Design a protein around this ligand. Structure first.
Ligand SMILES: OC[C@H]1O[C@H](O)[C@H](O)[C@@H]1O
Ligand SMILES: OC[C@H]1O[C@H](O)[C@H](O)[C@@H]1O
Ligand SMILES: OC[C@H]1O[C@H](O)[C@H](O)[C@@H]1O
Ligand SMILES: Nc1ccnc(=O)[nH]1
Ligand SMILES: Nc1ccnc(=O)[nH]1
Ligand SMILES: Nc1ccnc(=O)[nH]1
Lengths: 157, 157, 157, 157, 157, 157
């Protein structure tokens, strides 16, 4: 079985983001086409091991910002697939940027929306950058070796 | 004396977006290094003239969405400079994507934040994609012929 | 008032190619948004002046081929706009490649089809690379300062 | 043994194209450096499973065209190697475009020409985009783990 | 009549660098196809005005280095043409990098070698990145509106 | 254990370059995250098997130069990781270019400096293109499956 690596594109700044984050991670553990061990998870790759939520002194540190921004870009570019955990009511400017960068690096761009939200309107530009969008409950079985383009079954705004 | 064109990256949903929109447009009218006539303004480039406010059925039409998404991308890629009107309290996933695309297309990426908001925290990836971020009040006089790299004087989360 | 440069993507082998070539060139002479003097016209940029019709031995010379191929690429990349004179009954693998390169270099990609042929089926990938496809008769007046995305009004196989 | 995936660049619109198509597919089955199971074959990845030759109603459907064009681009970008089954007397504008896109995505670009045709002149731009070109009868043994640049043993036009 | 901007890729450490620097600058002043005012000259764009000769402590500051590196990249990407003042006996790893970046950004890449040095061996990769290499004495009159591909008349190691 | 391939970026034109070359190669033999067999080593991939140091007749051969330049680019683009064996006192314009090309191809860019030299100032642009820089003695154990961004522990100039 060939396995692909991913970049774990996900916000961690609301309750629904954190729920979706936890679910997507569990799905990837169970997906046999994914090497999660060798995938890039931003939250474990922040500069110096520090997160600005737990250490607000780094809010103005430009070294921390430079290194953590660069590590994320590096995580996208050196992994096979771009994953975006996407909350339609709570869309993330950071993830938006990362989607655009992933496009520029020739990565498959897959959005995953919580089942409770799948079908709701999403930003036109998210719709467009995406190669495909699926429900959280499809993530454990998604075949990352044969990724295809498909349209969201949903509206844009 | 030489003038550059821009893509007008700006939301139009909320009150603060519309205020900033109006201000940024006024600033560009007054900036002698900008050819606004030949710049790309999304709101004046709605596909086939269809107005989605008066016909929201087109938000489920894949052709409408494809052409609108493509027009935006096209507007970024065929103009000199990427302008992002950025509201820190109302950060936009669509703008985020556009910023990343502009980076990939080799464009100068300039964010403009309302003076009332300049200093407030912005997403790390917005900070990083940007080549520079300035206050609305500096847009009138920004020299687009000699665009330089600088850091936001502000917080980043 | 501002003028853009183009790469003149057009075959010169067949009768229909040469007719379309002559027409497109005439249209560009008359278009006020085009600087034709500073555009790249392959046929006037033959390497070292060597004329391959009168010296076909150079078709086996790797240096001749390297420089000619590179000049074409260079002409696309250093000009504003990619123009493809496209004959639906005589589709050209070389033009196809040039279109893809122009896409990769962030250029507006405009196809022009003779009015007698506009509507006839074109290759799916030609349809897709293109930002727009127009009739020869619209080239005279095309505004290259405000190039927009649109779909071919025609069939695609 | 490491294996690479490919995009199966090949026309299917003439008798010689179909012959070459069949031969190249058989060669890939036998090549131990290729994972054919996880490779992208356009003809099995058309939108909705439908081919326009067998269902000409889709000749004007822009949804079908959008999705099938996008899936092909996605197939090139997410696979390791670009393969072009190339008939020198019957060159394909679609494949031409795909070669250019593959170049932009940093893929090895390999042309395969039927033995009966190998040596015949090929389009200059095909010659140039290519990293290498081989005979159909070399395809079963080509080592895709160690792909190198070489010149066609043949003319251009 | 139309003028193009450049990035002034040139070292300033050695005597030969400084001689060539002075000469190339003089040539560009006299070239009517160049807008030197709006070109990017590193030495006039030192970050925050800090002069590293008088304050070498900033060579250990990561913020200084980040901004300076980014300014250079920005200067290449937002100008029309990449100019590399190249000394064959004193080849520069930094210039090498800048050349590669300019290639990636779709810029014409022109090397200029002092006439006393034109013909001397240059690195294979310098030879290859370049679209053209000329003598200092030809810079005054180089037509930057019609930049063409050609080979160095000289040795390459 | 997943393995990655590399491009062996290294000069071979001084005694210290050759020492570092030999050491880096030995380190890669011992690194279990590297497939060295399928990696690209320039010195074994020169056109026709010939090196210009041992056959100076090829110093003016443009065919040799074209093919060997193109093979190196191909070696960077088809391998997972860009390695630069870097001597701070003896920096290489060729490697500089290759670093820039590797950046454009989305590759992890890793510099390796002899332990005797690690800490010495390096060119600003080398510092910036790099994703990370390590000592020769770290190379045998570097985990290429989880490559991260880090700052050089050293100065620039
Ligand atoms: O806004 C946070 C984003 O930065 C990057 C992370 O994946 C996350 O998606
Ligand atoms: O013209 C048909 C082409 O579209 C794409 C397929 O590979 C094929 O090469
Ligand atoms: O200057 C020599 C360089 O060309 C390329 C090789 O890796 C080497 O790094
Ligand atoms: N604090 C952060 C914001 C966005 N992305 C990150 O990786 N970290
Ligand atoms: N009908 C088609 C033409 C070209 N390419 C395809 O994948 N399909
Ligand atoms: N002679 C050479 C110089 C640079 N790079 C190479 O691969 N070969």
């Amino acid at each position: 079985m060939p396995k692909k690596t991913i970049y774990f594109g996900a916000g961690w700044f609301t309750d629904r983001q954190n729920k979706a984050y936890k679910e997507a991670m569990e799905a990837l553990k169970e997906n046999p086409t994914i090497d999660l061990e060798n995938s890039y998870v931003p939250l474990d790759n922040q500069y110096k091991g520090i997160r600005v939520d737990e250490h607000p002194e780094y809010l103005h540190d430009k070294v921390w910002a430079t290194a953590t921004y660069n590590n994320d870009l590096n995580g996208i570019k050196t992994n096979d697939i771009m994953l975006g955990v996407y909350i339609p009511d709570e869309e993330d400017v950071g993830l938006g940027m990362e989607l655009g960068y992933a496009l520029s690096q020739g990565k498959y761009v897959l959005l995953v929306i919580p089942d409770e939200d799948y079908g709701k309107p999403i930003n036109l530009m998210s719709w467009g950058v995406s190669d495909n969008v699926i429900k959280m409950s499809q993530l454990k079985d998604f075949n990352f070796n044969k990724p295809r383009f498909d349209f969201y079954e949903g509206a844009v705004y």
